[PDB]
Amino acid sequence: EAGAKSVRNLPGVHILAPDQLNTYDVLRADDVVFSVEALNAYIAANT
Amino acid sequence: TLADPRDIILAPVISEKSYGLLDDNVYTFLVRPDSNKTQIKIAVEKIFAVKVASVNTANRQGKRKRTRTGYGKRKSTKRAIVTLAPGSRPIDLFG
Amino acid sequence: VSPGELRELTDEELAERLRESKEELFNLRFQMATGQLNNNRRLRTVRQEIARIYTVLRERELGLATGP
Amino acid sequence: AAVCDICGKGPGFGKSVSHSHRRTSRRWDPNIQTVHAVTRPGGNKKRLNVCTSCIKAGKITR
RNA sequence: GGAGCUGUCAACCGAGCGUGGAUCCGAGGAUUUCCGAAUGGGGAAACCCAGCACGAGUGAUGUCGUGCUACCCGCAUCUGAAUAUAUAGGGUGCGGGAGGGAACGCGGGGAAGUGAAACAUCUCAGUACCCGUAGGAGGAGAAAACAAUUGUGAUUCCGCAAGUAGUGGCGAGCGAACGCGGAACAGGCUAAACCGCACGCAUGGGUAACCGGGUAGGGGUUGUGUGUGCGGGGUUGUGGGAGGAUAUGUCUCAGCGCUACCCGGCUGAGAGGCAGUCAGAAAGUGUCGUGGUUAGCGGAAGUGGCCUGGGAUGGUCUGCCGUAGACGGUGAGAGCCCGGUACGCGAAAACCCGGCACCUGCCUAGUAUCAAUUCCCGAGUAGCAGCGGGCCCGUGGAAUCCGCUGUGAAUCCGCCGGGACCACCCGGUAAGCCUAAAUACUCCUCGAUGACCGAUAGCGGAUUAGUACCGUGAGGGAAUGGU
Ligand SMILES: [Mg+2]
Ligand SMILES: [Mg+2]
Ligand SMILES: [Mg+2]
Ligand SMILES: [Mg+2]
Ligand SMILES: [Mg+2]
Ligand SMILES: [Mg+2]
Ligand SMILES: [Mg+2]
Ligand SMILES: [Mg+2]
Ligand SMILES: [Mg+2]
Ligand SMILES: [Mg+2]
Ligand SMILES: [Mg+2]
Ligand SMILES: [Mg+2]
Ligand SMILES: [Mg+2]
Ligand SMILES: [Mg+2]
Ligand SMILES: [Mg+2]
Ligand SMILES: [Mg+2]
Ligand SMILES: [Mg+2]
Ligand SMILES: [Mg+2]
Ligand SMILES: [Mg+2]
Ligand SMILES: [Mg+2]
Ligand SMILES: [Mg+2]
Ligand SMILES: [Mg+2]
Ligand SMILES: [Mg+2]
Ligand SMILES: [Mg+2]
Ligand SMILES: [Mg+2]
Ligand SMILES: [Mg+2]
Ligand SMILES: [Mg+2]
Ligand SMILES: [Mg+2]
Ligand SMILES: [Mg+2]
Ligand SMILES: [Mg+2]
Ligand SMILES: [Mg+2]
Ligand SMILES: [Mg+2]
Ligand SMILES: [Mg+2]
Ligand SMILES: [Mg+2]
Ligand SMILES: [Mg+2]
Ligand SMILES: [Zn+2]
């Protein structure tokens, strides 16, 4: 929650959780930034 | 909670009929509309220190006046016309 | 008249401050009818101080802040 | 009457079925019989409306 | 709370108040005419007239102010008519009820139009409407349960089973349950046998018992049986309980059951353990919370240049904030001008929730084995029959469940259910009561949302709106926003 609060009110930055990835939010964004704790927790859930 | 004879008598009537009765020592008061002639006679003999011969009362309905938000009825009064004793002190109603 | 200065009056000075303040309203109701009252804010003032005296006399027979 | 003054038993409502199976409303009223009951022996009587199932038991005396 | 204010259609004025804290916001208190369940008696609701007690006023009747006085039910007392026991009724003092509310709940009453291409059975539909009566939810509920040879183990609710089994002038249509997956979990008191004590009825006087049992006497009639109450004992399905028999066992003191002794029980206090606002008993006084609600306040960063214009929030170059780029206002698209937002601070008093005391209550004698003779396990009930209601089941071979009428059992070697019924086997112990949670609803209070409406739309109602107007009445019911 230290970095979640840091990028709330930037225009264009949308924040979601690893278990809340969905097609409408990936395709709206030109760039997808994973936290390294969040990218491993997405790969280890889909093997 | 105690009473007062000045709670019955509200105000005097100021009109060119009531000025014509001041010459004969006859006074016109607006009284509270739930008061009989004996309350009014005990009160005038205790407020002004005078002797009262007779009290004549007259209810009057309120006027109803046209207004753009509808009709509206005014307040309903009770006059009481007080005749003093033959030869007592006149009441100074301050004008 | 402040409420703080009506509380040192004992038990029957309030009954004769109530009595000489209903005469003050009575003389002011005659001056409004005859049109000889310039200060018309004094009708509102005397009605409040009659109302303020009944509050002090009622508290003393309800057991709230008694004392001469 | 149709209401017992001890057990509170009232009428039940049902139907009345004909041969063409047409159904109309009627009442099963209870067998209410009047009694002049006493409380203590030799006492004064009192008119009550009781049913026959409470005279068959010992709910009242006479 | 912090400098203006005396609400608003809706101004024009008049006269005043405020840094000695006003107006305004919140909490508690006082006042609270008259009608209305309306309740002193009356009435055409908002009016009319009193009685009694205590005060005020008058020379004295007049007059006045504050209290109290309906009816019914319940409890506690006094009186006890015809009439004797007595009751009905009456007097007195305490408590309670009545009426209203948008939906939701439970019990009871109960249509029709319509569908059947007509219609009567059936449907619509146990719907509309109606009556009784609640609670913050209610009802239900601790197996007379299902199941079928292994088993599940209170109820309610949602999804399946399933538009299936079936049921139907086998027409139109209607329609389960077994069982499986979940939400949520909780279990507790009484009646009876018998044992003490209190009151009433009947019987008995050395017939006899009883005086806690045994052991000696004494007393010399308060026993024996039964009825109504209050305690103890008892709460079960693998049947349990009372009553026996044998071992085993009792925290202190006082009192008590004719006297002594051995033993045991009862009452009161103390000590110790437990439980508590609860379904399992119930009220209250204190004190303390990192607590909650009913006002609030603080809160970062541009007077930036030039162009356009009445106006910059616009364009165009620049400077910053962001745990704040939600929304709105401001002379046109504003994070940086304002009210605020993110994020933190704030409660005298009242109320709610919780903790600790105070207080209140329960427990401190039984436990274990054997015996299987007796006693008990909820009565005008179950069952049976007659007529009906409802179950998928429309009277059918019709079980289970419920109503009225009639007949009318048994206490465990009992009784009820397992879809007529019988035998066997399995399952459970009806005719007493209470029980949180999951579920249903929003007149009303705060806080957000909309590929919702934007004045013939959205509520009938942005405007005198249930207003004007129409109707005797119940009811009907508009139109009108923008400098
Ligand atoms: Mg008053
Ligand atoms: Mg005359
Ligand atoms: Mg007249
Ligand atoms: Mg005119
Ligand atoms: Mg009757
Ligand atoms: Mg019926
Ligand atoms: Mg029909
Ligand atoms: Mg019967
Ligand atoms: Mg205030
Ligand atoms: Mg207030
Ligand atoms: Mg009345
Ligand atoms: Mg009446
Ligand atoms: Mg008698
Ligand atoms: Mg009610
Ligand atoms: Mg029909
Ligand atoms: Mg028809
Ligand atoms: Mg038809
Ligand atoms: Mg047709
Ligand atoms: Mg309940
Ligand atoms: Mg289940
Ligand atoms: Mg008992
Ligand atoms: Mg502020
Ligand atoms: Mg600011
Ligand atoms: Mg704007
Ligand atoms: Mg904005
Ligand atoms: Mg049937
Ligand atoms: Mg069978
Ligand atoms: Mg039983
Ligand atoms: Mg039972
Ligand atoms: Mg119940
Ligand atoms: Mg519930
Ligand atoms: Mg709202
Ligand atoms: Mg409209
Ligand atoms: Mg338009
Ligand atoms: Mg009319
Ligand atoms: Zn009966």
UniProtKB/Swiss-Prot annotation, chain A:
Name of the gene encoding the protein in the UniProt record: rplD
Job description of the protein: One of the primary rRNA binding proteins, this protein initially binds near the 5'-end of the 23S rRNA. It is important during the early stages of 50S assembly. It makes multiple contacts with different domains of the 23S rRNA in the assembled 50S subunit and ribosome.
Whole-protein coverage range: 169 to 215 of 223
Query: Which positions form S-S bridges?
Result: none
Its family remark reads: Belongs to the universal ribosomal protein uL4 family.
What is the name attached to this protein's record? Large ribosomal subunit protein uL4
Q: Where are the transmembrane segments?
A: none
Subunit info?
Part of the 50S ribosomal subunit.
Domain of life per record: Bacteria
Swiss-Prot record, chain B:
InterPro entries in the cross-refs: Nucleotide-bd_a/b_plait_sf (IPR012677), Ribosomal_uL23-like (IPR013025), Ribosomal_uL23/eL15/eS24_sf (IPR012678), Ribosomal_uL23_CS (IPR001014)
For this UniProt entry, what's an example GO CC term?
plasma membrane
Concerning PROSITE patterns, the annotation shows: RIBOSOMAL_L23
What function does this protein fulfil?
Answer: One of the early assembly proteins it binds 23S rRNA. One of the proteins that surrounds the polypeptide exit tunnel on the outside of the ribosome. Forms the main docking site for trigger factor binding to the ribosome.
- List the Pfam families hit by this protein, alphabetically: Ribosomal_L23 (PF00276)
PANTHER family in the record, alphabetically? Answer: 60S RIBOSOMAL PROTEIN L23A
Say which family it is in: Belongs to the universal ribosomal protein uL23 family.
Name listed for the protein in its UniProt record: Large ribosomal subunit protein uL23
The encoding gene is rplW
Q: Which keywords accompany this UniProt record? A: Ribonucleoprotein, Ribosomal protein, RNA-binding, rRNA-binding
Q: Which domain of life is it from?
A: Bacteria
Iron as a keyword of this entry, yes or no, is: no
Query: Which GO BP annotation is one of this protein's?
Result: translation
Please tell me what else the database record remarks about this protein: Was identified as a high-confidence drug target.
Q: What is the source species?
A: Mycobacterium tuberculosis (strain ATCC 25618 / H37Rv)
Q: Which GO terms describe its molecular function?
A: rRNA binding; structural constituent of ribosome
Subunit field text: Part of the 50S ribosomal subunit. Contacts protein L29, and trigger factor when it is bound to the ribosome.
Curated annotation (Swiss-Prot), chain C:
**Pfam families per UniProt:** Ribosomal_L29
Molecular function terms from GO: structural constituent of ribosome
What Gene Ontology cellular component terms go with this record? cytosolic large ribosomal subunit
One GO process term, biological-process aspect: translation
**Family the UniProt entry places it in:** Belongs to the universal ribosomal protein uL29 family.
What the entry lists under NCBIfam families is as follows: L29
Full protein name: Large ribosomal subunit protein uL29
